[PDB]
């Protein structure tokens, strides 16, 4: 008993209300409090946490891209340049704090308590994602650290997913998608990214042909994202 | 009286069932019969007609792209290439027949029964669209005919929408979106395409600044597509 | 040109093009003509025929489920149009299934020389009679249900003698046969028993250290577990 006096069911209901109200900072704070109470998250709670932070960090990633693009297209005006730099750095600090909170949750609560391979792939992918987001804005030795940590988390998730999951599993597919984006954007390796995405797509399609596709709409949505990236990148 | 003896309400209900069952040939046939009764379509009927034929023609457009792609990658096998040619031509004939039915409907019923500017723009844009689909597969002097007819329909819808509709109107925005695709894909004029799309986005965002955005969600979604197309095009 | 003046290889090339184009009616027609030439299908030709008709029949099965569902959530006008539209889809489904069963009886099964091929085609006969049984009312249902059970049962007996428990066709036959018991015969215990036996015997033989090498087997093991979970919950 302390400052957070709501129980898990109240926090989860608060998170669902915040989502509907498009108040994602509130949503993330609620699901962070759920996670910090030591509960191994349910699939529903896991998804709420992921959606909350995706939108919290996504808003800052978008603002950072806008301000960065303004700052880089500002040639003559010095004072605008310096203001854009300071604003970018303020957004960077928010983004770094958000990613730090997520990675803290992952290392302290989520990954150590994941006993099922599906949960371990899900959270290791999330770890790869948030180190990737840090890598989008990092520089120097810090960027070396975040890129390496992102790759290591993705690679471990990737190996587990190929041993323990079928090619049509949506978590395995979503991992392949984001790992390919990591190769494409962070490592500037478009051919390796295409090769990854193409194998994941082809192996899922071959297995999907044996199945009733109506039970795998989440898989087919992600396979279309793989195909769209392949179109863009080729 | 003849072979088709359902009344308009029965046909619309059957169109709605066929849409749920993902049977778009049935859905289009029902809405074609509705249209041939000769009465001005309601917004609900106009959308059912449009969605049915978008799905029918879209299946052929998708298949055409796949087969035409295979046809141009078969360097050695003159027999895989001759069969690929004939199959592409079979698909083209289907596409041409579908577009012909829609263009027939537009000229016989839909455009002459449009009295409000919003309805004229919607059907002229539809005319531009279906001549654009014909332009995707046409060649020689038929392509000259289809390209010019697409452009003339788009241009007429464009001038009406500029004079009679606000920049936030979804039909005006959707016209700008598809007309810019026409410039980009059919006319191979990316600067014209980008200028049309950004101008439409800019005039809409300026007006939305004055309004409550809650009743303009459909305008915002099309503005996001304009945004996305501009991202890809430059 | 026409299927009756085409060589097998040209019809197969057509089927492959239709598949890439997602034109499954075209794909099925080409592979039907291949089968009607009367020669035993290769593995590739079997896969092309089976995928084509799975997609052709599957579109109708899925429409039929959608229309049947709307029939229940309903107004005499809307309910009678749903019944007519459903009977429309039923008629297409029955035509598709009878074509496949004709191919199985006249060409595929009497040409099956290896036990694996015989189990596959018997499982296929069971499947398509099951799809008939999903919509068969009153009288004709008893014949299709019996013909489905008979086809499955014989494949079941061959598979247990000729195939290891990790064999994907033995696993797939058990999966679909158990679905038949659960859904068509309304025998959920026997359905669960068949699926759990198949899962237990496979997990007893599976090389856990090289699961990479048996993803075809583990796929269906997961499907069997999925069904058992769904049914006992």
């Amino acid at each position: 008993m302390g400052s957070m006096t709501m129980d898990k069911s109240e926090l989860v209901q608060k998170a669902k209300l915040a989502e509907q109200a498009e108040r994602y900072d509130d949503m993330a704070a609620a699901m962070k409090a759920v996670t910090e109470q030591g509960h191994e998250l349910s699939n529903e709670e896991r998804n709420l946490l992921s959606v909350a932070y995706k939108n919290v960090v996504g808003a800052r990633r978008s603002s950072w891209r806008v301000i960065s693009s303004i700052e880089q297209k500002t040639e003559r005006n010095e004072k605008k340049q310096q203001m854009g730099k300071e604003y970018r750095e303020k957004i960077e600090a928010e983004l770094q704090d958000i990613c730090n909170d997520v990675l803290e949750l992952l290392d302290k609560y989520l990954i150590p308590n994941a006993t099922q391979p599906e949960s371990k792939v899900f959270y290791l992918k999330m770890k790869g994602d948030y180190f990737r987001y840090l890598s989008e804005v990092a520089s120097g030795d810090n960027k070396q650290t975040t890129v390496s940590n992102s790759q290591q988390a993705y690679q471990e998730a990737f190996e587990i997913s190929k041993k323990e999951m079928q090619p049509t599993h949506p978590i395995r597919l979503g991992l392949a998608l984001n790992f390919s984006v990591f190769y494409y954007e962070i490592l500037n390796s478009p051919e390796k990214a295409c090769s990854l995405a193409k194998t994941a797509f082809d192996e899922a399609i071959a297995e999907l042909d044996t199945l009733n596709e109506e039970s795998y709409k989440d898989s087919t949505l992600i396979m279309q994202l793989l195909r769209d990236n392949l179109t863009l990148w080729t | 009286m003849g072979s088709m003896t359902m009344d308009k309400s029965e046909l619309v209900q059957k169109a709605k069932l066929a849409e749920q069952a993902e049977r778009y040939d049935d859905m289009a046939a029902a809405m074609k019969a509705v249209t041939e009764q000769g009465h001005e379509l309601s917004n609900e009927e106009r959308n059912l007609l449009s969605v049915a034929y978008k799905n029918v023609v879209g299946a052929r457009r998708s298949s055409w792209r796949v087969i035409s792609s295979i046809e141009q990658k078969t360097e050695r096998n003159e027999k895989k290439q001759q069969m690929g040619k004939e199959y592409r031509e079979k698909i083209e004939a289907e596409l041409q027949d579908i577009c012909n039915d829609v263009l027939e409907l537009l000229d016989k019923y839909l455009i002459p029964n449009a009295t409000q500017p919003e309805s004229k723009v919607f059907y002229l844009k539809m005319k531009g669209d279906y001549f654009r689909y014909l332009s995707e597969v046409a060649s020689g002097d038929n392509k000259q005919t289809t390209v010019s007819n697409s452009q003339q329909a788009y241009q007429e819808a464009f001038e009406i929408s500029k004079k009679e509709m606000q920049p936030t109107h979804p039909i005006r925005l959707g016209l700008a979106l598809n007309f810019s695709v026409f410039y980009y894909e059919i006319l191979n004029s990316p600067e014209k395409a980008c200028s049309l799309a950004k101008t439409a986005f800019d005039e809409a965002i300026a007006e939305l600044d004055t309004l409550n955005e809650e009743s303009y969600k459909d305008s915002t979604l099309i503005m996001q597509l304009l945004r996305d197309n501009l991202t890809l095009w430059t | 040109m026409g299927s009756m003046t085409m060589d097998k290889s040209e019809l197969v090339q057509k089927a492959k093009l239709a598949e890439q184009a997602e034109r499954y009616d075209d794909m099925a027609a080409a592979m039907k003509a291949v089968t009607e030439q009367g020669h035993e299908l290769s593995n590739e030709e079997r896969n092309l025929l089976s995928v084509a008709y799975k997609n052709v029949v599957g579109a109708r099965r899925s429409s039929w489920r959608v229309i049947s569902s709307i029939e229940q959530k309903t107004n005499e006008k809307k309910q009678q149009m749903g019944k007519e539209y459903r009977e429309k889809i039923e008629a297409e489904l029955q035509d598709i299934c009878n074509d496949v069963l004709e191919l199985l009886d006249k060409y595929l099964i009497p040409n099956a020389t290896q036990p694996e091929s015989k189990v596959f085609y018997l499982k296929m006969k069971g499947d398509y009679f099951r799809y008939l049984s999903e919509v068969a009312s009153g009288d004709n249902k008893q014949t299709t249900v019996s013909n489905s059970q008979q086809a499955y049962q014989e494949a079941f007996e061959i598979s247990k003698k000729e195939m290891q428990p990790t064999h994907p066709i033995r696993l797939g036959l058990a999966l679909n046969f158990s679905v038949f018991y659960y859904e068509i015969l309304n025998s959920p215990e026997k359905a669960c028993s068949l699926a759990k036996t198949a899962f237990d015997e496979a997990i007893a033989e599976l090389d856990t250290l090289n699961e990479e090498s048996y993803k075809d087997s583990t796929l269906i093991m997961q499907l069997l577990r999925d069904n058992l979970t769904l049914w006992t919950s």
Partner: peptide
């Protein structure tokens, strides 16, 4: 800017199977 898509938010029928022996 080089466009690309990462995975979006993702948020019960018995299964049957077809064997495609390669």
């Amino acid at each position: 800017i080089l466009p690309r898509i990462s995975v979006i938010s993702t948020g019960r029928r018995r299964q049957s199977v077809l064997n495609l022996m390669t």
